[PDB]
Write a protein that binds this ligand. Structure first.
Ligand SMILES: Cc1c(COC(=O)[C@H]2[C@H](/C=C(/Cl)C(F)(F)F)C2(C)C)cccc1-c1ccccc1
Length: 252
């Protein structure tokens, strides 16, 4: 019944960041997609071209349109805002939701709740320190005056200096940060899995667990001993857990 798995990147990233995971899931008999969201393909217009979430998430809605059966949606970090939005508008196409140290907000809550300081167990101050606003808060861009800090904070999981340029973009749209989760009704029956990254310092495990705690209804959880990017440091263990979920998301 599940034919496709769609892996969705987070802020400042592109689908290619999943390159170590895609073939492993393909060996589990799945068709695997890792698309660029809107604004994430060099030459497409970049951050100011994103109008709203329907626009931002439209490359996935396209994939879900032509899938033979049901799909698993995975979001990394900010990518969770997209899979929640998509689940609500394509609940008939999504059989499961995977939040990989990802923004999991309750219906009506925007991601900024957990990024900005607050109580309890809210805040990603390492990211706000290193990622700065541009174009009057319509864009965010990394602080390139602190390259080693950027690497050790966000790309510490990369095997062997840094990931290749194909994995990243220069400027991110603030559109997903400010959009509330519209999941209601049918979408809240979709089985949900949170994969925690225990040593994440971008999104601390306390914040991760606080998000699970405040979402209404059950959230399954598996824990990985990784920092911000498990798709770089343990693709095998990560793809294994994704495929076991896809095999039977209702039971996992
Ligand atoms: C951003 C980035 C990432 C994914 O990070 C995220 O999406 C963070 C986002 C939170 C926040 Cl507050 C923010 F978006 F602002 F960072 C979560 C949603 C907590 C992964 C790997 C490298 C870089 C990066 C690539 C090039 C240069 C620097 C870093």
């Amino acid at each position: 019944t599940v034919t496709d798995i769609i892996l969705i990147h987070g802020a400042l990233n592109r689908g290619a960041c999943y390159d170590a995971v895609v073939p492993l899931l393909e060996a589990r008999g799945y068709r695997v997609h890792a698309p660029d969201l809107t604004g994430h393909t060099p030459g497409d217009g970049g951050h100011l071209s994103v109008v709203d979430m329907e626009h931002y998430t439209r490359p996935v809605a396209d994939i879900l349109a032509r899938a033979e059966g049901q799909s698993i949606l995975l979001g990394h970090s900010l990518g969770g805002a997209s899979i929640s939005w998509l689940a609500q508008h394509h609940p008939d196409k999504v059989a499961g939701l995977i939040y990989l140290t990802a923004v999991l907000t309750a219906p009506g809550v925007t991601p900024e709740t957990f990024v900005l300081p607050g109580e309890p167990n809210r805040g990603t101050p390492h990211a706000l320190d290193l990622i700065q606003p541009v174009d009057e808060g319509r864009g965010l861009q990394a602080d390139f005056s602190r390259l080693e800090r950027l690497r050790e904070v966000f790309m510490g999981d990369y095997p062997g200096g840094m990931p290749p340029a194909e994995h990243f973009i220069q400027t991110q749209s603030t559109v997903p940060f400010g959009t509330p989760n519209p999941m209601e009704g049918r979408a809240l029956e979709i089985p949900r899995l949170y994969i925690e990254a225990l040593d994440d310092v971008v999104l601390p495990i306390a914040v991760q667990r606080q998000m699970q705690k405040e979402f209404p209804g059950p959230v399954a959880v598996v824990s990985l001993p990784a920092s911000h990017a498990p798709y770089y440091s343990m693709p095998e263990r990560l793809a294994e857990a994704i495929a076991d979920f896809a095999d039977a998301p209702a039971e996992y």
